[model samples]
Target: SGAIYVGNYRVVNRHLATHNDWANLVWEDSSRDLLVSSTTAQGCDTIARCDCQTGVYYCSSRRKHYPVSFSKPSLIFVEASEYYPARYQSHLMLAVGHSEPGDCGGILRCQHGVVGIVSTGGNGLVGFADVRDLLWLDEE
Candidate 1:
């Protein structure tokens, strides 16, 4: 018999950038005190504030680092679409990231993106669509 052992899940920041001084990626849920203190990701030394629920990353200023933000379309509008998954229903999502080549060691980096379902055309680096990735179960 095969059993699935689902342990407490958390987001991971690979620290795939060039600088070691940079902060590692983390998940932030303030209501649970996860964000109240500095945290580190698996295999990474730099501490970063990540929002597991929303999958948002913070900069030294504690605000979303990426500049651009987009909102998901309403259900009624996209319900009939084949690409629209039933799981994404009723969730107000805003992705924050940028497509421009900006500061790396100063204000910007390659790790800008969000985690959600996207269409075929949306596949690319600029989409960030660099958002962190995680796995979890949902009541579908």
Candidate 2:
């Protein structure tokens, strides 16, 4: 009924990638939270209220048949991609398209294993954090 509130990769890196298109979640169940990016950013491509209390992004577009806004549609696949930041950066983080019908938080995978976790998005792309840095962010 309720979702868990865990800190995002932004907690690890103050400069973590984020976007208005893909909102951040305040509470999540990992699998079911795709429908709930608990941020004020435009979620589900709909212009409506985002409930940080209930942990759900209200999809105001009444065109869909779903009782709630659609979450990871399962078919909005994004192929492996990369990015190169301007200034002092070049080809650092990976990228994925924004049409993948999902929020801004999920593990990016390879055919064999996980490589990164979706962290930020903008313009027409989504960015993620490298797992190597993820491990470095933890100590125990």
Candidate 3:
């Protein structure tokens, strides 16, 4: 059921410059409330807007950070044939169940942190844009 349209939202910035043929990124800021999602793999992550009362996440909860282990099975995979920056390249292997167009742009979060974005996957294997690696501050 569709309803009235809201004010216009537009993309204003992006992460350009690819390395070894990686993915390009773009984003838009909004005045609208916010968004959340769910998985379907059959249940692709959906961009749902604010509709109900949301939970509170006060850092007062003692924000504990977890390190991503290379040998641990604590990671999940998402995305399609998208490219990320080579500068941020890291090898990640995932054995999920399925991949759909809806899988693209799916988040790669562990321990409640923005680590990666889905960019490519097939036959149950997925490739992610390693955001943490890409945003690393360094000089050439």
Candidate topping lDDT: 2
Model 3, range 72-138, lDDT digits (tens) per residue? 2223333322432222223332434344434544444544344344444567454433333322111
> Each model's TM-score?
0.20, 0.30, 0.33
lDDT of 1 by residue, 1-140 (tens): 00111132222221112132134323433111111112233222222123333333233323344443435323221222232333333222334443222211121122322232221111122212212222331101
In candidate 2, the residue pairs with backbone N, CA or C atoms under 3 Å apart (3 or more residues apart, or in different chains) clash, namely 17-120, 84-91
Question: Considering every candidate listed, which one attains the maximal TM-score?
Answer: 3
What are the per-residue Cα lDDT tens digits for candidate 2 across 1-140?
11112222232221323463136633222221122234332212111122111111211122221111122212232332243223221112433344232333344443233333344445655444333323322221
Clashing pairs in 1: 26-50, 27-50, 28-50, 28-51, 113-130, 113-131, 114-131
Candidate 2, overall lDDT? 0.29
